[PDB]
């Protein structure tokens, strides 16, 4: 669709085409995180530290529970109908809520039914004594418990209990609990005012467990090649289903997606390169990633996605509209494309695509050793293309490259093209540029008003 | 003030009103951080490691002290007057300084008088051997010392001193000091060129103590319910008062605020929702938090503040001005409000406020089960409101909600409104859009200039 060879003369080069793939249909598994460790092995040297700890940690879980009780008890199961089965929500009592938040309210109720099975294991949860342990939910199902600091207690304190004094053992425990709380607050502190939401990435939830999210995922028992990609694309997420202030454990439901490609959609990356105009170097200012869907052109805010070597992985659809004036650049009207003046000493001056070099040879010593003659561009040409029809191997700086053959028009080096208007992109410049335009318009507007009014 | 029910038809919904609350009137407490640990328990296996360490760590404290001496000896106490008591600052010698920095220079001198009491404890400071220890400043007063790594030495190395060789004990110590320095530089390296400034948040200072800022605050002995909120709004801050290159401790003064509400001020959040126009979906582009003070409307850069469920906590006043063309939207001239085209597949299409749904029922299958009939909007309507007077319970997607009654004008579903101009928000689109405007102006300007000149 887009006119590559016209677009190329203004300092752009065709990048690698990437498939567009996104999250879909997540699976669910429930796990319990126990925030307070077990110390019965050496209780005689714990003293009061565990009472102070519980007094503080209770102070940060109670706001979460209070915010979650709203949806958890202002909703009911539908009765009196058989054509539809589902929940019913007391909108009058909920008051103000977003569509996404209301949807999470349904998932929470749907999950609460299963969480109540785990709630019967309360006596075993309190008796754990390893970092990871497996419990029989029923003869038919099992749940995994992850303990915050049981490894440190089992490894450093329990063995040295005879050499270090009882006082210093207690103190060496206090520092660990305090360090852990100092970290935990960044996730479960006041920043978590909407725990009903189901979008918190699992790397955040895992801060309740020393950040060792690798084990927290290994316990799920799923396996796929996409595992490294789903992690980095922030697609794996966990929702807080239940919390119990009498034992300091939270139950989280983990959602595990499977990736899907989107049909007839691809992302075209564009490599920019500086070019000559008059005596000045210029760079065209156009979006670096162009997204095509069903031959419609749109702009993607790619900062939210993972740009792998072959495809772009996004946790959700991130397309955004494009001004029609800009679209005209991509469909071949180079007069529309803005350009910014180059004033730094180092900026890219050549690139390679399909084995053909595009080079701003006015600023780099382009030449080819097959004949030893230099390559030179006159002031009329913005860029030169180099291929094996002119010379088989060429040198740039001191890099030596062997070249392919160009597939487009043979006269590329002799056509030239109509370049567009200059623009400045700095935020403080923009704030000045808007006012400067307004003053210029105002001088013009006063002319029309006077001629219409005074010389009607 | 602002005209909600006109504003609503362009895809906005009234969010939760929040009180506006800020820092005030901090208290001060002084504490010592000792950066080099004590190793006399096992000195024979330290070898040379402590001399190399001191050689490096001195190299990063000396640039801090050099920047602090400037104010510490170019200032004097006022004499020869009794109408005022205070400092006097040698502006000729200070040379170039900001107003905030000069103010912190007064605080430094005011604090230096107390720090010199702590300076008499130098022999005891060097003789600490726990992670926290309490010292008598006088019979009247006490200071706390926090030691960098004393727990690790007391817990891992001192017990194993017999089983591990002396060489590997020295090496296992060297790694720990080097790890600590690798972290410390991110706060006390070159980024801290202005240590006189009194605004460094205490989470940063606590990097001198392994980031266990919870103990560094527990030692203060203050208690308040606000404690989690003052932390997370970054309102608690520490100033470096003194440093001693012969013993490697710094004295920091901690400032502890109490919060205040601001009278007659509140923040109105607005929930956006997409709406139909023509066949296209649109989103109106207006500031999502509107700040009202004494019925002046102004714009807040809320990213500097903490949005709790009931109030916004800011470490200082963050209001900013609003363009009068934008204000005209909020006081009800919907013709002004810009809108951006929707081209992603998923963006919010309904919301709830006061138990009344606002729904873009052209794109979600709105219906109500009390009769089983569908709800439909014609192309003239941007949104529908749904309430229990049209039908008591309604379905969206497959969420089922029970509804309140609307308080405003009864005819909401029949008015329609004058929707405003389209706009595109991407930074590269803006960099195009200014130039396109300029070319359009220039053709117009040339018409006036020629007519005025050639046919004068």
């Amino acid at each position, epitope marked *: 669709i887009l006119h590559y060879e016209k677009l190329s003369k203004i300092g752009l080069v065709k990048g690698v085409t990437r498939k567009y793939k996104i999250k*879909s249909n997540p699976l669910t598994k429930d796990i319990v995180i126990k925030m307070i460790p077990n110390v019965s092995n050496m209780s005689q040297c714990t003293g009061s530290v565990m009472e102070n700890y519980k007094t503080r940690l209770n102070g940060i879980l109670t706001p979460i529970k209070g915010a979650l009780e709203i949806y958890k008890n202002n909703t009911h199961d539908l009765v009196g109908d058989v054509r539809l089965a589902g929940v019913i929500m007391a909108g009058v009592a909920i008051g103000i809520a977003t569509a996404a938040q209301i949807t999470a309210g*349904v998932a929470l109720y749907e999950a609460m039914k299963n969480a109540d099975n785990i709630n019967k294991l309360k006596s075993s949860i309190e008796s754990t004594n390893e970092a990871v342990v497996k419990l029989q939910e029923t003869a038919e199902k099992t749940v995994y418990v992850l303990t915050a600091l049981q490894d440190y207690i089992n490894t450093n304190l329990v063995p040295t209990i005879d050499k270090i004094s009882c006082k210093q053992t207690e103190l060496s425990l206090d520092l660990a609990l305090s360090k852990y709380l100092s970290d935990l607050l960044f996730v479960f502190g006041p920043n978590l005012q909407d725990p009903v939401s189901n979008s918190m990435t699992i790397q955040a939830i895992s801060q309740a467990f020393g950040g060792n999210y690798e084990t927290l995922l290994r316990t799920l028992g799923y396996a796929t090649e996409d595992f490294d990609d789903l992690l980095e694309s922030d697609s794996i997420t966990g929702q807080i289903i239940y919390v119990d202030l009498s034992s300091y454990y939270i139950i989280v439901r983990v959602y595990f997606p499977i990736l899907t490609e989107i049909q007839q959609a691809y992302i075209q990356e564009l490599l920019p390169v500086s070019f000559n105009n008059d005596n000045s170097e210029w760079i065209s200012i156009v979006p670096n990633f162009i997204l095509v869907r069903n031959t419609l052109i749109s702009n993607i805010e790619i900062g939210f996605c993972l740009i792998t070597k072959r495809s772009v992985i996004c946790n959700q659809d991130y397309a955004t509209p494009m001004t029609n004036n800009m679209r005209e650049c991509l469909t071949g009207s180079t007069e529309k494309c803005p350009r910014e003046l180059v004033v730094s000493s180092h900026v890219p001056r050549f690139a390679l695509s399909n084995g053909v070099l595009f080079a701003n040879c006015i600023s780099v010593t382009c030449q080819c050793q097959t004949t030893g003659r230099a390559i030179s561009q006159s002031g009329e040409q913005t860029l030169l293309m180099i291929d094996n029809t002119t010379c088989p191997t060429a040198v740039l700086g001191n890099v030596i490259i062997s070249l392919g053959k160009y597939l487009g028009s043979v006269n590329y080096n002799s056509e030239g093209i109509a370049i567009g208007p200059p623009v400045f992109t700095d935020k403080v410049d923009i704030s000045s540029q808007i006012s400067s335009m307004n003053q210029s318009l105002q001088q013009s507007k006063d002319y029309i008003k006077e001629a219409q009014r005074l010389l009607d | 003030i602002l005209h909600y029910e006109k504003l609503s038809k362009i895809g906005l919904v009234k969010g939760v009103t929040r009180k506006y609350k800020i820092k005030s009137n901090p208290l001060t407490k002084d504490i010592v951080i000792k950066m080099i640990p004590n190793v006399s328990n096992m000195s024979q296996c330290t070898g040379s490691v402590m001399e190399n360490y001191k050689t490096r760590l001195n190299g990063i404290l000396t640039p801090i002290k050099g920047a602090l001496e400037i104010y510490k000896n170019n200032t004097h106490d006022l004499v020869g007057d009794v109408r005022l008591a205070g400092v006097i600052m040698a502006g000729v010698a200070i040379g170039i300084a900001t107003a905030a920095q000069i103010t912190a220079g007064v605080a430094l001198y005011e604090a230096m008088k107390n720090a010199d009491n702590i300076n008499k404890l130098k022999s005891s400071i060097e003789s600490t051997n726990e992670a926290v220890v309490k010292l008598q400043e006088t019979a009247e007063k006490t200071v706390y010392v926090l030691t960098a790594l004393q727990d690790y030495i007391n817990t891992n190395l001192v017990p194993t001193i017999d089983k591990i060789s002396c060489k590997q004990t020295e090496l296992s110590l060297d790694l720990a000091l080097s790890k600590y320095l690798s972290d410390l530089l991110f706060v006390f390296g070159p980024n801290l060129q202005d240590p006189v400034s009194n605004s460094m948040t205490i989470q940063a200072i606590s990097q001198a103590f392994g980031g266990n800022y919870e103990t560094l605050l527990r030692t203060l002995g203050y208690a308040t319910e606000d404690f989690d909120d003052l932390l997370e709004s970054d309102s608690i801050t520490g100033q470096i008062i003194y440093v001693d290159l012969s013993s490697y401790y710094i004295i920091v003064r901690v400032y502890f605020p109490i919060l205040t509400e601001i009278q007659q001020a509140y923040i109105q959040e607005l929930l956006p929702v997409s709406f139909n126009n023509d066949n296209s979906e649109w989103i109106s582009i207006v500031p999502n938090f509107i700040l009202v003070r004494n019925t002046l409307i102004s714009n807040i850069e809320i990213g500097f503040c903490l949005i709790t469920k009931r109030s916004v906590i800011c470490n200082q006043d963050y209001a900013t001005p609003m363009t009068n063309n934008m204000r005209e939207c909020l006081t009800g001239s919907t013709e002004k409000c810009p809108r951006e085209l929707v081209v992603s597949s998923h963006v919010p299409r309904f919301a709830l406020s006061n138990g009344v749904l606002f729904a873009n029922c052209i794109s979600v299958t709105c219906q109500c089960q009390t009769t089983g009939r569908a709800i439909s909007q014609s192309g003239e309507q941007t949104l529908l409101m749904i309430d229990n007077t049209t039908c008591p319970t309604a379905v969206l997607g497959n969420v089922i909600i029970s509804l309140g009654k609307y308080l405003g004008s009864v005819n909401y579903n029949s008015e329609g409104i004058a929707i405003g101009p389209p706009v595109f928000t991407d930074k590269v689109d803006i960099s195009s859009q200014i130039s396109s405007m300029n070319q359009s102006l220039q053709q117009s300007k040339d018409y006036i200039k020629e007519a005025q000149r050639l046919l004068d």
Partner: nanobody
Amino acid sequence: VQLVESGGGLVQAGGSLRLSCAASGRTFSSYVMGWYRQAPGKEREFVARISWSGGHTHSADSVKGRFTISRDNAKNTVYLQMNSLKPDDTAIYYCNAEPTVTGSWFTPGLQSYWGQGTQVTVSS
């Protein structure tokens, strides 16, 4: 929408099978397919899952390398190839199909379809 499983039966331990699920209607080109099995005296456990294009698969770690899954959009079928079956693998196998959804992580009442199930057993 109707699904039907086929090819079950009895095999010697260490044997192999090709369980085949077949679909109906034109809509087959967009459904996430998968398999669940119900061992006697156990909850229905997940086995494998496959995207619409067949380029992406996901499965339980307990069957990693042991089992492989593939789909054919021309025949409108899903194939599960099992190797070196152990005695514990005996269970009823159910074919599963689920319409593709994105955006929200949860979708209330998302319509799911299940096959009729088929028997698989292993002899020591």
